């Protein structure tokens, strides 16, 4: 990307935006790409703004205040431009205050007498033009500069909070939810930048209004005292309505946050939710809180209507309060009423528009500043000091607990030398991870000293994968090597299956490694830890998804031979690992039973324990069209009354002009939308949003997996978060306001033109010139905006991803790397945003300069060919001056509404997203022949020529090497992937049946468990069509009853996503309980014994096999002891399945990839008949 031309440019160029010319011209001809857009300017880059603000905050915190404030630190580095651009806004708006007099002098000097003055018109008219043009010359650069400042504020705050959250402690990290932290940023991103202009009026409006009322006080009469009182009542009425919005608006945002949290859950675990068949249920779950939300929006909109309507209706009321009282005292003045009128309106504008919008921001921003200040002042993580003098780890009397400092760990003692491996072991929730967390330095111990050498590696229990390549995750910062890398891949047994992929290496992985298998994520995450050089290695249960063979090989080659002379701590429950290892550690409820060698354990007493966009929008709701006709017809007859109404006065009455000023001044109220006229528009434009949301959610949730796995979570979520909240909240009032301003201006321009026709002559040429200039901007800008909104998604997806696997980032000390990566994703965004914002200012500035030509040629053409002896064509200068003052505000909306309307197309893409359009037999007979499955169309084959059969209600066993396709078979059976064959059930297939009914036949328990936010009632049965004792029966049946009884509100216990409330094993136990209640013939089981103890499986199988009495089951496990119960067996090979009756046949037919792998305990029972001859 070439450097930004803004730096290498003239002042005159940067002021008038001449540098923008090429990028517009290129955008006009052809379509733009992310390659085409410029680099960000060097002044407002990420690294400089962060380094700036942090210093002032550091010293402000370091000074030792009673309460450190962010404003005091912030103000010291942003005061200079704020006041400098602020001064221009004051002198700019102060221009208005002197308009009444200059306007008032020419209209005064119209009819004093015929002869005294000639020059007065032209001099003061040219002066009015000079004074007018001085304003927007003075005013426009201030806005741009002051916006651009707000961008520099927001980039610094995103940077410093990210730097903070990366070093935030684990005790407090669990308390803070991710959704609210993201949603805090997602709302502000755009709004906060643009909002500063309104906020600067907090001292402008009070200073101006006192000077304004001081000048209108030149009216001695109490008449003036009556006139101003109309502004005060309106002003308090405005702020009164803003109060009533508060409790409704505040209560709604909370109710929104529930939905955005739930949509994030359902769409992250989108693979599982389809397999059960929970579309309409989830749609219903979303529809309730959605139904509750819209009810409040109606009230927020209805109050926000009168907020707008009271402003437009007040022109009639305010104007009569000046003139009619003055009729009592020294009546019908020559020129004082016009001055008074102009002072009355400019005052009204300030109280109605500026000051509420000013105190709107300051009241909002202080709470934002309070929360960030609170967030920056939280518990900080301590980095481990590295020193070489210590060579082996030392613990003594370690006691520790989460959120209290009963204890999690209690008085641990262990003494490990260099070049030794320890074996941690125990039951569910014994505290095996917490011991690693204390050694790691994440959890701080309360009473007990813990000492070690600094550098540590760590492999997590739930392995996570970065967005990039397999190489990137294995290397993970460190440089590439020839045989180091290869020895790790060879040792970790990741070489064969990696070669089998379509691309050899460097496969671009989706969110969380969905394109990789369950076991591969463990081995790649292992390899990561193996590849680096460190003193201590912590492997927290790496062999949970691996086979017996791969485990055996990895344990012999990788753990023993390759890591020889490295200290290891491995979590496991296998006799052979415990036997080979040096020292054992047996936890139980946070306290240790035994600590020593294996023969010493045996000598002890416990022997062995274990228009297209608009037409589609309007046509979605026909009720809005029946309103749209009403607005056009009434406005036309409202116009008809004014056209005819003037002539009645003009005929009775050269000097038929001063009434035209009052009409133009009074126009807004005459052409306003009444109570019956305006409210139906707001009602219909809400109801459309309720449907338009409900259509999208249904369309997105029912689509094929190849299309869904193409898209990331953020790309989808960005439609729900921003674009839906835009069309919900903002669009109704802006689309209301747009019609008003067009009807007023177009209505007014026609009727002022009908009198004195040749004023129309000036407007014909440039209006079309203006419309061309708009179409010139809209081609390049609107297109550039869509790039900016896509550039928003990588920020939050990078933020939220960082919080999931933060524990590793700390272990590998890669925090600075992620900051650098985070700034790159910002700089690409701000480049786009800065460019777009500049191209808007070009158009906005060109709109004003274009206005000067209309004005002067209207002045030049409107002139006496003969002697204009009344003169004062200046009054036409005055009529044009005021009417087109609001035209800038009318245009200002035109860009906002149109650009914001293009967010609707993004929804319309998702609505039109490609999708798929007797008693079911007790006989659970299933056969498959010549099946072939593929994930991506026109890609590689995962299965090829698969053929097998299962007997009616028979127990079948599936085996195979890790990454053979055991899950993909279940995806093929359930139709989540492309297939070529004929799967049969009772001599029936999908020829007649739809997918819905085909899905209800099965009972799934997937690899990845899915437990969403809500109570256990909603988890165990989302429909809600079961008895309590029926739920208690299955809780006893599964072997999950007691652990529920220990909780408060036993069955209505608030269960969060992730967390620590239930252990991993319990999440499987829940996932089984789903399939109990499902009531299906066929059951698909993808590794039930994942994080289950040997003790739990025996008590499971005892009671579980009487529940599943009359139903077929398809198991797929690496553990043998759960598997050996079932009848038939089938193994998965390179291509296809080959079947066997018994284990004796299976293991002997298999070529010692399982026979020589199973331990002496199964070789006790297996060779019993041969050896016991
Ligand atoms: N990060 C955490 N924050 C707060 N509490 C936690 C955290 N991790 C675990 N806990 C709680 O403390 C207990 C410690 O058990 P822990 O999960 O360490 O045992 P474990 O052997 O790692 O579990 P598993 O057998 O599932 O691997 C858990 O039962 C849980 O309730
Ligand atoms: N979502 C996916 N998209 C594309 N390819 C996939 C996907 N999931 C798996 N694969 C491919 O299929 C192979 C293994 O499939 P699968 O995950 O069904 O095996 P598995 O038996 O479930 O693995 P494990 O035994 O580790 O659980 C891998 O080599 C992988 O490339
Ligand atoms: Mg654990
Ligand atoms: Mg699998």
From Swiss-Prot:
Name the record gives this protein: Cystic fibrosis transmembrane conductance regulator
Record's function text: Epithelial ion channel that plays an important role in the regulation of epithelial ion and water transport and fluid homeostasis. Mediates the transport of chloride ions across the cell membrane. Possesses an intrinsic ATPase activity and utilizes ATP to gate its channel; the passive flow of anions through the channel is gated by cycles of ATP binding and hydrolysis by the ATP-binding domains. The ion channel is also permeable to HCO(3)(-); selectivity depends on the extracellular chloride concentration.
Note: Mutations that lead to the production of a severely truncated protein that ends before the start of the fourth transmembrane domain disrupt normal left-right body patterning during embryogenesis and abolish lumen expansion of Kupffer's vesicle.
Cellular compartments annotated: Apical cell membrane; Early endosome membrane; Cell membrane; Recycling endosome membrane
InterPro entries (alphabetical): AAA+_ATPase, ABC1_TM_dom, ABC1_TM_sf, ABC_transporter-like_ATP-bd, ABC_transporter-like_CS, ABC_transporter_C-like, CFTR/ABCC7, CFTR_reg_dom
PTM description: Phosphorylated; this activates the channel. Dephosphorylation strongly decreases ATPase activity. Phosphorylation at PKA sites activates the channel. Phosphorylation at PKC sites enhances the response to phosphorylation by PKA.
Catalysis: reaction(s): ATP + H2O + closed Cl(-) channel = ADP + phosphate + open Cl(-) channel; chloride(in) = chloride(out); hydrogencarbonate(in) = hydrogencarbonate(out); ATP + H2O = ADP + phosphate + H(+)
Primary location group: membrane
Family: Belongs to the ABC transporter superfamily. ABCC family. CFTR transporter (TC 3.A.1.202) subfamily.
ABC transporter domain mapped to chain residues: 406-610, 926-1159
Amino-acid positions noted as binding ATP 1 in the UniProt annotation, renumbered to this chain: 402, 426-433, 461
A GO CC annotation given for this chain: early endosome membrane
Extracellular side: 100-123, 217-224, 321-340, 756-757, 861-874
Tissue-level expression: Detected in gut epithelium (at protein level). Detected in kidney, spleen, intestine and liver. Detected in pancreatic duct epithelium at 5 dpf and throughout adult life.
Topological region Cytoplasmic: 1-78, 150-195, 246-299, 683-732, 779-839, 896-1173
Lineage, uppermost ranks: Eukaryota, Metazoa, Chordata, Craniata, Vertebrata
Species annotation: Danio rerio (Zebrafish)
Keywords annotated in UniProt: ATP-binding, Cell membrane, Chloride, Chloride channel, Endoplasmic reticulum, Endosome, Glycoprotein, Ion channel, Ion transport, Isomerase, Membrane, Nucleotide-binding, Phosphoprotein, Repeat, Transmembrane, Transmembrane helix, Transport
EC number of this enzyme: 5.6.1.6
MF (Gene Ontology): ABC-type transporter activity; ATP binding; ATP hydrolysis activity; ATPase-coupled transmembrane transporter activity; bicarbonate transmembrane transporter activity; chloride channel activity; intracellularly ATP-gated chloride channel activity
PANTHER family found in the cross-reference section: ATP-BINDING CASSETTE SUB-FAMILY C, CYSTIC FIBROSIS TRANSMEMBRANE CONDUCTANCE REGULATOR
Membrane association type: Multi-pass membrane protein
Reported phenotype of the disruption mutant: Considerable lethality around 10 dpf. No effect on initial pancreas development, but at 16 dpf mutants display loss of pancreatic acinar tissue. At 22 dpf, most pancreatic acinar tissue has disappeared and has been replaced by fibrotic tissue that surrounds dilated, mucus-filled ducts. Morpholino knockdown of the protein in 48 hpf embryos leads to impaired resistance to P.aeruginosa strain PA14 and strain SMC573, as shown by the increased bacterial burden, but there is no effect on resistance to E.tarda, B.cenocepacia, S.aureus MZ100, E.coli XL-10 and H.influenzae Hib EAGAN.
């Amino acid at each position: 990307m070439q450097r930004s031309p803004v730096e290498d440019a003239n002042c005159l160029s940067r002021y008038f935006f001449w540098w923008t010319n090429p990028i517009m011209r290129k955008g006009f001809k052809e379509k733009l790409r992310p390659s085409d857009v410029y680099q960000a300017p060097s002044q407002d880059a990420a690294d400089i703004l962060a380094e700036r603000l942090e210093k002032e905050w550091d010293r402000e915190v370091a000074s030792g205040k009673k309460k450190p404030s962010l404003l005091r630190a912030m103000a010291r580095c942003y005061i200079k431009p704020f006041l400098l651009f602020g001064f221009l806004l004051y002198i700019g708006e102060a221009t208005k205050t002197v308009q009444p007099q200059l306007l008032g002098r020419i209209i005064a000097s119209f009819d004093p007498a015929h002869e005294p003055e000639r020059a007065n018109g032209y001099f003061l008219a040219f002066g009015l033009g000079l004074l007018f043009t001085a304003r927007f010359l003075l005013l426009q650069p201030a806005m741009f500069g002051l916006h651009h400042l707000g961008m520099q504020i927001r980039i610094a705050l995103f940077s410093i909070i990210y730097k903070k959250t990366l070093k935030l402690s684990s005790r407090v990290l669990d308390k803070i939810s991710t959704g609210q932290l993201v949603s805090l940023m997602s709302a502000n991103l755009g709004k906060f930048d643009q909002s500063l202009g309104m906020a600067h009026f907090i001292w402008i409006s009070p200073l101006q209004c006192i000077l304004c009322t001081g000048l209108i006080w030149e009216l001695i009469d109490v008449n003036s005292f009556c006139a101003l009182a109309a502004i005060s009542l309106l002003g308090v009425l405005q702020a009164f309505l803003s109060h009533k919005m508060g409790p409704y608006k505040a209560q709604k945002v909370l109710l929104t946050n529930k939905r955005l949290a739930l949509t994030s859950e359902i769409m992250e675990n989108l693979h599982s939710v389809k397999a059960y068949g929970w579309e309409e249920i989830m749609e219903t779950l979303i529809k309730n809180i959605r139904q509750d939300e819209v009810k409040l929006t109606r009230k927020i909109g209805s109050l926000r209507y009168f907020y707008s309507s009271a402003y437009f209706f007040s022109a009639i009321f305010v104007i009569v309060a000046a003139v009619v009282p003055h009729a009592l005292s020294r009546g019908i003045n020559l020129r004082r009423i016009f001055t008074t009128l102009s002072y009355c309106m400019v005052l009204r504008m300030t109280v109605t528009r500026q000051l509420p919008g000013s105190i709107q921001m300051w009241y909002d921003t202080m709470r934002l500043i309070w929360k960030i200040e609170e967030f920056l002042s939280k518990e900080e993580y301590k980095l481990m000091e590295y020193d070489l003098s210590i060579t082996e780890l030392e613990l003594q009397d370690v006691t520790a607990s989460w959120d209290e400092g009963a204890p999690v760990l209690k008085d641990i003692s262990l003494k490990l030398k260099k070049g030794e491996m320890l074996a941690v072991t125990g039951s569910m929730g014994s505290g095996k991870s917490s011991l690693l967390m204390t050694i790691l330095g994440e959890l701080v111990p309360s009473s007990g000293k813990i000492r070690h050498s600094g550098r540590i590696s760590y492999s997590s229990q739930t392995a996570w994968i970065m967005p990039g390549t397999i190489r990137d995750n294995i290397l993970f910062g460190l440089t590439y090597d020839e045989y180091r890398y290869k020895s790790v891949v060879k040792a970790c047994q990741l070489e064969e299956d990696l070669a089998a992929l379509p691309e050899k290496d460097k496969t671009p992985m989706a969110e969380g490694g969905l394109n990789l298998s369950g076991g591969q994520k463990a081995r790649v995450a292992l390899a990561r830890a193996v590849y680096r050089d460190a003193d201590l290695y912590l492997l927290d249960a790496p062999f949970t998804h691996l086979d017996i063979a791969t485990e055996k090989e990895i344990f012999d080659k990788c753990l023993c031979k390759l890591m020889a002379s490295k200290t290891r701590i491995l979590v496991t429950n296998k006799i052979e690992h415990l036997k080979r290892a040096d020292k054992i550690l047996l936890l139980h409820n946070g306290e240790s039973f035994f600590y020593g060698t294996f023969p010493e354990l045996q000598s002890e007493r416990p022997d062995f324990s274990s228009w297209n966009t608009y037409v589609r929008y309007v046509s979605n709701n026909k009720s809005l069209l029946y309103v749209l006709i009403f607005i056009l017809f009434i406005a036309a007859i409202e116009i008809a009354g004014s056209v005819a109404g003037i002539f009645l006065i003009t005929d009775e009455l050269t000097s038929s002009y001063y009434i035209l000023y009052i009409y133009v001044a009074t126009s807004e109220s005459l052409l306003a939308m009444g109570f019956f006229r305006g409210l139906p528009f707001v009602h219909t434009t809400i109801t459309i949003s309720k449907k338009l949301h409900q259509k999208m959610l249904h369309a997105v949730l029912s689509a094929p997996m190849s299309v869904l796995n193409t898209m990331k979570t953020g790309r989808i979520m960005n439609r729900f978060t921003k674009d839906m909240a835009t069309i919900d909240d903002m669009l109704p009032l802006l689309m209301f306001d747009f019609v008003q301003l067009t009807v007023v201006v177009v209505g007014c321009i026609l009727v002022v033109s009908i009198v004195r026709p040749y004023i129309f002559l000036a407007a014909t040429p440039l209006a079309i010139i203006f419309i061309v200039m708009r179409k010139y901007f809209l081609r390049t800008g609107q297109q550039l905006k869509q790039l900016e909104t896509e550039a928003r998604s990588p920020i939050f997806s990078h933020l939220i991803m960082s919080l999931k696997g933060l524990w590793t980032i700390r272990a590998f000390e890669r925090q600075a790397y992620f900051e650098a990566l985070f700034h790159k994703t910002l700089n690409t965004h701000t480049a786009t945003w800065f460019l777009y914002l500049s191209t808007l200012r070009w158009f906005l500035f060109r709109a004003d300069i274009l206005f000067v030509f209309f004005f002067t040629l209207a002045a030049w053409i409107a002139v006496g060919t003969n002697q204009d002896k009344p003169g004062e064509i200046g009054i036409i200068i005055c009529l044009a001056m005021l009417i087109l003052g609001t035209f800038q505000w009318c245009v200002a909306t035109s860009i906002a509404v149109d650009g914001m309307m293009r967010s609707v197309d993004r929804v319309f893409k998702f609505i039109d997203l490609p999708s798929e359009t007797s008693s079911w037999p007790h006989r659970g007979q299933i056969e498959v022949r010549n099946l072939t499955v593929k994930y991506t169309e026109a890609g590689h084959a995962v299965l090829k020529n698969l053929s097998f059969s299962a007997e009616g209600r028979q127990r079948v066993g599936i085996l195979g090497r890790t990454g053979s396709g055991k899950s993909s078979l279940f995806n093929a059976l359930l139709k989540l992937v492309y297939t070529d064959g004929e799967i049969s059930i009772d001599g029936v297939n999908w020829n007649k049946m739809p997918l819905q009914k085909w899905r209800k036949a099965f009972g799934v328990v997937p690899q990845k468990v899915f437990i969403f936010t809500g109570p256990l009632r909603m988890n165990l049965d989302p429909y809600g069509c079961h008895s309590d004792e029926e739920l208690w029966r299955v809780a006893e049946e599964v072997g999950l009853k007691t652990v529920i009884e220990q909780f408060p509100d036993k069955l209505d216990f608030q269960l969060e996503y992730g967390g620590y409330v239930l252990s991993n094993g319990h999440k499987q136990l829940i996932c089984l309980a789903r399939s109990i209640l499902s009531g299906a013939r066929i059951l698909l089981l993808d590794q039930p014994s994942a994080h289950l103890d040997p003790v739990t499986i025996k008590v499971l199988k005892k009671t579980l096999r009487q529940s599943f009495s009359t139903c077929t089951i398809l198991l797929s496990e690496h553990k043998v002891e759960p598997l050996l119960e079932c009848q038939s067996f089938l193994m998965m090979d390179k291509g296809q399945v080959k079947t066997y009756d018994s284990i004796q046949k299976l293991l002997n037919e298999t070529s010692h990839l399982k026979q020589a792998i199973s331990p002496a305990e199964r070789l006790k029972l297996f060779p019993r008949r041969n050896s016991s001859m």
